[PDB]
Design a protein around this ligand. Structure first.
Ligand SMILES: *[C@@H]1O[C@H](CO)[C@@H](O[C@@H]2O[C@H](CO)[C@@H](O)[C@H](O)[C@H]2NC(C)=O)[C@H](O[C@@H]2O[C@@H](C)[C@@H](O)[C@@H](O)[C@@H]2O)[C@H]1NC(C)=O
Ligand SMILES: *[C@@H]1O[C@H](CO)[C@@H](O[C@@H]2O[C@H](CO)[C@@H](O)[C@H](O)[C@H]2NC(C)=O)[C@H](O[C@@H]2O[C@@H](C)[C@@H](O)[C@@H](O)[C@@H]2O)[C@H]1NC(C)=O
Ligand SMILES: [Ca+2]
Ligand SMILES: [Ca+2]
Ligand SMILES: [Mn+2]
Ligand SMILES: [Mn+2]
Lengths: 243, 243
């Protein structure tokens, strides 16, 4: 079939072989209960200048020449543990070509290399970033933000992420949806007894990504932080695109 | 303040006075544990030709002349109990003027009157419908569907809702988000060990609705069905619209 549907309610079954279900790249490791994205020393304390990626092993069908295009929805809970405020650099949910890998650390979030990050013609990646650091270089807005990145680290759209959420170290739940008929990407971020964050933008994936992609989480530090992914669900559907 | 934030995890505190927190119109009633939208006989069994609305009592600020516009997110779980398959007519989450009320039953979902339902100039309502009945009259697609209605019962966009979900009588969770900067409305519907449904569409609320609205649930039957709302959360934010 052309669609995907998986659900990991938690990651307490930390025993599967790298590359069978989830592939860990760079400094991303599987620990009991979580996908850890960047490096920590013996005490779980975050190491500076590190990048890692945890991505689903099977290729994910996005679109085909015949007009079939997948709509999708992914939800995940994560803990961006902070060791002070502010911290750097954040994490990202992404869709990239199957052959790609982790790139630069820090503000590039393991997704871009320094020399081509602001060039949309040299990159093929769509990402939803949870950026804890204002890099003026890449035109980050003057606060922690959530952003939608299309082929570049300069977001096509961002919304404010409050300091206390961004550096508060609480578990957060994210829902990211893509409607393939209207070409809309929506991000919803919720904190249990807190506020929600909404960011939606029109982006046609068929025009920016190959027909089949790898999906996953990418992180880049920075300092005083480490992101843990606690659960992951993904569902894609061809509904409404003639199949 | 101009924003709203409430959370009802369940409705087991069925004792609040009508109109203080939630207002019940028509045949919608408050029962232990749920907001019941249409009528049932002594045994909880659904009565035909009924309409009811359960809406939040305070007015909800949407936009103002000065450009401030509210982004929002609402989540709710509901049980559309079915007494066979197919059943009629569904339910809807809506945003309408503060002075409005419940309208016709059946395929109008308590939201429109028969004579002006297909006329966008005579209505001011934005609704997300979960339609269990194909009314060829109103150009419903040939299946249960989820639809986005703007000033008319003829949806500006729909996506397929599978028969087994539509008439399966399981609790479903819906997330509806509106981003006021990009004018995008997204609907996410999830079933626990099932599939998800994604429908997003560009709709500028400031151009179709008054500055302050009432929000709620509306239902219209039909036959062999009754909708129960089990929980409700709403959050609105002025973020990114200069306030
Ligand atoms: C998990 O499996 C991956 C293969 O699907 C490993 O990545 C590959 O590692 C090779 C070195 O062991 C490297 O030459 C390959 O290019 C790389 N594959 C990709 C797509 O980059 C992965 O190894 C980790 O990731 C690479 C990129 C390095 O940073 C290694 O240090 C990492 O170990 C495997 N994970 C492991 C061993 O944890
Ligand atoms: C809950 O409070 C409402 C007032 O905020 C009631 O609605 C009002 O009911 C009047 C008749 O009792 C009617 O003249 C008003 O127009 C109506 N308000 C609106 C906005 O329509 C409501 O009454 C229910 O809803 C109305 C529309 C009728 O269908 C009544 O039969 C219902 O009782 C109150 N709910 C109750 C008493 O359950
Ligand atoms: Ca940054
Ligand atoms: Ca209908
Ligand atoms: Mn950024
Ligand atoms: Mn319909």
């Amino acid at each position: 079939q052309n669609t995907v549907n998986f659900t990991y309610p938690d990651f307490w079954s930390y025993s599967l072989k790298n590359g069978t279900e989830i592939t860990f790249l760079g400094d991303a490791t599987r620990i009991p209960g979580a996908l850890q994205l960047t490096k920590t020393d013996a005490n779980g304390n975050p190491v500076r200048s590190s990048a890692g990626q945890a991505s689903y092993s099977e290729p994910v069908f996005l679109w085909d020449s015949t007009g079939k295009a997948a709509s999708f929805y992914t939800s995940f809970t994560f803990l961006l543990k902070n060791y002070g405020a502010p911290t750097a650099d954040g994490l990202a949910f992404f869709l990239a070509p199957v052959d790609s890998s982790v790139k630069d650390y820090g503000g590039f979030l393991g997704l871009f290399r320094h020399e081509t990050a602001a060039d949309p013609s040299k990159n093929q990646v769509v990402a939803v970033e949870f950026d804890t650091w204002i890099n003026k270089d890449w035109n980050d807005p003057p606060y922690p933000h959530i952003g939608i990145d299309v082929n570049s680290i300069v977001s096509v759209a961002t919304t404010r992420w409050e300091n206390d959420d961004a550096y508060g170290s609480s578990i957060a739940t994210a829902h990211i949806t893509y409607d393939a008929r209207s070409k809309i990407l929506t991000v919803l971020l919720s904190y249990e007894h807190g506020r929600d964050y909404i960011l939606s933008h029109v982006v046609d994936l068929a025009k920016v990504l190959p027909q089949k992609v790898r999906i996953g989480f990418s992180a880049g530090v920075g300092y005083d932080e480490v992101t843990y992914i606690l659960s992951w669900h993904f569902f894609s559907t061809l509904d409404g695109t003639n199949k």
